[PDB]
Amino acid sequence: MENAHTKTVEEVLGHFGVNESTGLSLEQVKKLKERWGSNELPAEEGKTLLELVIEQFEDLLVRILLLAACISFVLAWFEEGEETITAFVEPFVILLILVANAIVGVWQERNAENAIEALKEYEPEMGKVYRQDRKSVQRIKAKDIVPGDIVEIAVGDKVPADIRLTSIKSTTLRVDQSILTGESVSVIKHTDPVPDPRAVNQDKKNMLFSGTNIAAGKAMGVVVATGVNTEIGKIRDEMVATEQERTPLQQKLDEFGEQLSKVISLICIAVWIINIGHFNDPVHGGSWIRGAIYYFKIAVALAVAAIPEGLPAVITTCLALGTRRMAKKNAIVRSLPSVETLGCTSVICSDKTGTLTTNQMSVCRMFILDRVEGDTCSLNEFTITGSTYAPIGEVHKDDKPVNCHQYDGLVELATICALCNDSALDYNEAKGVYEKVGEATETALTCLVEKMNVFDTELKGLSKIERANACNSVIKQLMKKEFTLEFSRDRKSMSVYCTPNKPSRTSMSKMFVKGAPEGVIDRCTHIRVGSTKVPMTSGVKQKIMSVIREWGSGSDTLRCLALATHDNPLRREEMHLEDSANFIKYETNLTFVGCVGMLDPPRIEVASSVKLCRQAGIRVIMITGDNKGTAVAICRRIGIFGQDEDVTSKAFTGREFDELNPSAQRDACLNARCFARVEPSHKSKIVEFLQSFDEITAMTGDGVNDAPALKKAEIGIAMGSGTAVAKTASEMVLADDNFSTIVAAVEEGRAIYNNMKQFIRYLISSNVGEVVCIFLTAALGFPEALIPVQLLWVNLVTDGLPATALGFNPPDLDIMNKPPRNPKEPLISGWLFFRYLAIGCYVGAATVGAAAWWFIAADGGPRVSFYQLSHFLQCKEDNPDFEGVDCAIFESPYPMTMALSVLVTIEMCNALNSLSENQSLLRMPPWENIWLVGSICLSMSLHFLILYVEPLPLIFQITPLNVTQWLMVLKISLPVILMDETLKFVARNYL
Template structure:
């Protein structure tokens, strides 16, 4: 900390001379000690490391074991298909992970290419990487700050720090300040300059106190480099599901092995059965399908003006219950705007100003002429406050260029941070108008008269009281207040020191970085949807509260807290109070991370929006980080999960709606796949338990899981969304994926399994010539009869699952109510799946690979009836569900 030390103390600490700077030898020694002035990044993962990381999953281990056993037993086709599944899943994972984190690279690019330093008494322009602590750095307008500096000189110096602190307007700097204490927010350290901020006005000289990773930007880089738990709720649930399925598969295999030993079956046959059960227990296509559904969701998001950088973010959006939003540029327009004025003794909105009133017109002319900014349709340059004043004139068709041609500037007194005033002298016909603007406290002391209702009158105590009341009213609403005054001179030849004396007050204007017009409605919709909006900003507390109040984030000032108060709170204290705080003001990057961590500790799913460098660590820490696409820095975009193309807060709400629908569709997909796999397990388990032949071969199950299941699962992933989805509260991320679906899952799995066994038994009896009812399954089947029976079971398993996908579209509504063809992709998937199944059993080569037999017309009749049963029975159940909900 150097903001609380005098210039002499800092110079002495670094052994530097403000006149000569460091010597070349000193700079080399310091470079050896402190290193280059650049940010470091961690070593990226190799492709091989990423590949093996993708294999670190219990489901993959089981599949690898199944592939090895299949290969050893000569079941080459099974082993190849399993290997393809593993490679596809690993490849998809690598593609996602290889979209490497670019935040630190973007931070490195923020460093300026050149810096002006004093070395051996000479001014030298050197690469910024060569700057060392103790260097004397020269800063002028338009130059980026190369490292963290303690100012030793400053002349009207203003620094744009919004990307680091969130401050809306450039900050006036003062080298002479020595700030007491240790808890001074970055935005209030007015004797310090920080790496990668921009000088917009004036000049300064500073001593380098921190370089590279020791700068404030470096601290952000370190936070970005920290590993955070970035698994989404769905990823965690799928990982947990994988463990359960893996344990279940091993348990079933062991149980079947015991059953086989007791039944004195062949050991080789039992190994094949075990492989079949392991394969049946695991929906091999599930990870790839979820990834693909999320990827398709990403394409939908782009249409909503949101670019998703990380696929799981699509799903996470659906469970977000807190949006932490940066104020500047996110909730507000990041553009200072005049909103109120005071003239003629009245306070009003700027759009009620009457240009036909002399006082009103003179007020605007004063603010436009006494102004160094430029304004055109394509370019706006200068201080944001002055640009806002020019914009106010443009709104009334008063343009600076035209006005200056008519009223040429003759003389001026530039703005000074001590006076907080600026004055120009402009020619009005034969007279010369002195135009002065600035802070109302300073300006009012220079005014002896006021221009009220066409009359110039002496400022009485009552008039002064009214003026200050209007100023305080605007300040209480977090407006930045500027006063305008003038006087008329018969000649321009006057002493410059006498220009700012005996002025006539025209009026005041109040300005603020206003809220985005559409944000208020979006926040209201969030509130109705059970989503809380929290504002986190680097701006002052009263400004933050005024914006929050205007947007209906909070009306209670006790729900606003400053960064200084935050520093005094322990993590436990913050965790206990975090739910009642709606606005955090004057915060640092470390504070933002602390806030997000506290919110997450309460089980919240947190979204953080922002655009500046200061937002990057919290964007990464949040469950989903959302960066602004237009005003956002590369650092923020690199750290975020999602980028808003239009910088519109309302786009977040649209994205959340899409995210909720996508999660619902993913849930449909998972329930569908698991119910199908349960059907496969039941068919195999019951057959072995009853001492029957194996109804399905491992390759049959792999085919169904990879192809027949996958097509409708993908189609369910793009099912049309629920238009009322934003009327519901966010789902609890702790809720089971199967909440409300467990019974449906088990019953449909049981139904598919029994139907598959029924087909197997019918096929076996029909082709063995057994006409007896008992035993259910005939003994001593010929190889051809067994192949026929397995083929019928294979087709029923496949087609019944295809038909079952129609049931998954809605829990209560009939498929005919929601429209049989309202999801054309699903109908297409069902038809295509049936054609593929027919293709396999009719093409000789494929039939030989899959060990299946062509079916007769009679066989297809049995198969069709059995396959339609899931749809028929579910439609009957839905009738009762609908009637019970009405009652």
């Protein structure tokens, strides 16, 4: 469509031929599925191989390998000599690094682009559509939405597509369009046409723009634009290009890469310097003037020896596969940096309802007025059985069954519960259970109405489906809900305006109210006794609150609601419904009717999870909107407070906290474990205090008003069943809403980072050894032990596999017995630095000695001397000192094979060392991580197949050595296990 905002609801519906009540059909969606494509934005993969090679700016070093060979081909034509077979073999070494560097960039990075998407794949963008599959609403993927679909939306929902509104269910619908327009205030919507065709998005008030979200209200509409056709889509410019802050770990790694890259010069400076064009030198020396390649090949070998080329691939694979493991544990990670932060968590601020509790609610208690004896009063108290959402149970008074219809107060009680309610029961025929639609708290009220049956409706002979709403339906037939004043967290109550269907001759409209007992009862000027109405006296008000306090603070820890009605409400025309802040003014002069209290038991594993946090040095703070008596009692039942613990300074209502002096407010955020009857402003305020203590805080939230605190906290954690707005503002989502999942995610974050410390200290260690190996060769003068072609293959394959498997090491048994990790924790400590040198110098010497062992001493090697080797460059037929000796053997695949096979076996040994940080292998056998053992074999087999498959050993300049020569490799390799084990023992039983 063109002008959808200008067209009428009937006109836009017509343009797609769709019914508002049944939506599109099965084939009609198929028809539009081919025309419009999905609702997805075509992020360009580009599959750009040709231009990825053009980008590839990562390795500066090996790019400098490109420059000396490329322009120098001027020499290839003018080359002085007849050499043919030995001519073009060497240039393959220089060029192959270039071709392979394309693979280093491409294969590793595209897998990272897939990682970011893999996080979204576990919880796909949803949207509520109406189609001919079901008469009720249907929840499908947002991408499966096509223009013409009927979409339903409510507070917290992300608008899945550009939508022309059709009907608004609440009194008002407000949308936060801040992502699309610059408007920071929610905009009010309607269903009328906007006749101006050139109107701006700010003025197209009958439209819902994709990417925006609903601040308040509920409504329906028809989709107009999807994909690129979306108002936001066409633009796709306001975006930055993946603008993110380096993690404290990647920074340390980037920093360690930038400091040492300058240290490359320290060794490189020492080499080039030499020429030092001799300012007093003879005229004729037989100088070898073609020597402008010696310092060049070494600098390239240094770079390949100093850079952990395999590190980013191992990191990306570790996080991604770790995240999936977390997602399996119902912790869905939206941001990869959060996994590092997660391990540092020092405070968890957890919501109570549904997170610490099970959110399976049932009303087991209720009361109404009985008699008013002057200033005192008696109550009719009742119990109610059945704890599920099944509409089956009995109502008792003094354990005797009762007819609820007899009590006029119970008839009103049930009426308020039926009417001031947005929820329903639904019988799941497949699972054979009753399920809730909407809030648990409200559905409990729904389920209560069925059990009360206050009009004595015949229920025998109704299906399971009919029994779900039957008594609720009866009350709705008598009393019509015209509009509702929605629940708000500031007044903590809700009201609905209702009128009888039968013309009454008298006003007879009412407002039925339910809410937190403290506030609602404060706004009651009268009490209902049966059908009579008498003024509320403080003696009566004290009685009501005492019982309510007793229900909430008992062992059942009842979530309580007070119920009341306004007998003389204002007319709809006299109320301003655009703002919830006005609603408390309209809910006053109320008549108190009764209270209910409902089970919401603690989760079973939460107590242990709270103990685990204590062991791990993680403070736990309960945060709730519920009553302080209820909150504290749960805190005792799950162990946040002791059974007998004095909580007078450890627990606060939002108001109490607000009334504290700043000094006392600071103490509260230091010592308090329970904040009750809070408003969304308190979470942010709490986070601000926690940050001033340098705490790293995990905060939970589900609602639109939780977004600021979720963003402000170091780890925002959104409920899986909560709003989309909250999820977008958070670093993690609890798929099951469970507090325990927070703790399990923290444990995983602690474990994943520990494994990363290993394969970082492991891959860097191999580089540290490779550097002193090249240094040993330059300083001791010896021939080339290892070539950059071997280092690259080792750092990508030989070291590549065990590093990844290192990411899968089992966590320490005490991993949750240690305090939170400081985010400023050094990646390598003083003693750990000694571990670098002790290992680095080992494999450095172990590879040079191995290459010089086959040379100087062996049965089957030529047996030169030290001076013959140190000066190998002087091996010429004219040098008096090189006399009766051959120069051909100085370049041989055998000594390099000894050095490489030693380097390989060393790393396979060092990998097993890296199974744990300080734990000896005797108690941490290599099979503790099976993937690690299988990693050694797959790489070693990759090292055998690099010899006995003819094309491989030729380009690698290696030859398979003898069985006798292979044993010498083990003689110098295995002892690295002994040295490292000694270095483990020393810290353990000494440091």
